Amino acid sequence: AERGYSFSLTTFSPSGKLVQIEYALAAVAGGAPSVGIKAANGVVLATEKKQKSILYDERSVHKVEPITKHIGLVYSGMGPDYRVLVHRARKLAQQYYLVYQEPIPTAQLVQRVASVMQEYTQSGGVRPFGVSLLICGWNEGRPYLFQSDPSGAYFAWKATAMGKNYVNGKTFLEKRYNEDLELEDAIHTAILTLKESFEGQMTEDNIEVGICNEAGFRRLTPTEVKDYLAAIA
């Protein structure tokens, strides 16, 4: 394309493309599938978590994790960068709580995580974060599902998917998604969305799902995931 305008994050290509940011987005796309649904009474995030072998103990490193009693986060991309971002998001939420005696609004948390990504994607000697985050929160009385991208841009998604088969997940959700939904059906919808592009049997211990309702964000236990997989199946 514009080859020479591809090794620098501080130089504009003639058409104006940020080639390095686009390549980071491609790296995000080439990652584990993840899906998010905004139910009318909550939010649900799911993400494909196949191991490369039985040796990998599928209980040490998570993919969907909390950031506060009412906010949680899942990722698609590189796991180390994801760990960095989740740590920074936890720190930002704690700073917000210290300054204001009130849990951080999900919109504010997403804004500041996007600001962190912006900070990392503006200098010529740093690598833009190679992940995209899906942040689910239960601020006020309504749910929130946001996406944050390496470019520092964030969105409010009704329901979306990202990763290897993001296009197929998006079409599937476009077909299956109705606004007047419930969290219980949203869980099944997300699980089916994963299964659509999933390879191999969907054992309860190789899929991770996290709900976010009025009771606060919570990663569903393997027993609950098994029960849900039986219910859909």
Binding site: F7, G79, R127, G130
Partner: protein, 241 residues
Amino acid sequence: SAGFDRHITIFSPEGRLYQVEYAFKAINQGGLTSVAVRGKDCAVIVTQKKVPDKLLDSSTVTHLFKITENIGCVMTGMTADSRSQVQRARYEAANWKYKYGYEIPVDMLCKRIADISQVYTQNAEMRPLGCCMILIGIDEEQGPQVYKCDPAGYYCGFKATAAGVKQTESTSFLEKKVKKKFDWTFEQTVETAITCLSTVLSIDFKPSEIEVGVVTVENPKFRILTEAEIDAHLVALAERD
């Protein structure tokens, strides 16, 4: 798409960090190999030894280090980077104990090392030191733990694993073994590790050309098995096989 290879922070058009991939290639450069396996209430690490001379001091030559009073590690890859990473891990563990008051969990130490490696990968200041570091320890609640610190910040926990030149074959043998009766005794897990090494290197080991470290729930102190103990285990297992 070939110019996106001389820097750590440049993304390839397909979104690949060829420099970190080359760091893994350097992991597969020390020649040596190592294996770790956790039993019902104990974990054991065994690594190939290479002392191609009578002049070298085998006492100093090693690849096992006690990161603290209850956690051990086996290195593989460049030896200088290995020692540097070992010292960094020791410092992190001591700092953790000083700051919080209880010894660092093995997963925590592995995570901190992974975070340091990821920082090096992201900020173009140092090359990602190319050593793969396997930790073993005893957690008061979850039992034995084994973890890896590959030079990209990924730190998944394991039941049993291998690192080095023959990691793929060792992994295949270990998964074959673990698919049946994953719960093993101390002797059983030591035998599994040693036989994995022997078969994958297509050779049997004299007591001097092998190192073994062990942690047990009964004795949760990283202990290096002596020549006598390793020879006894070797002979007993070979006889009873």
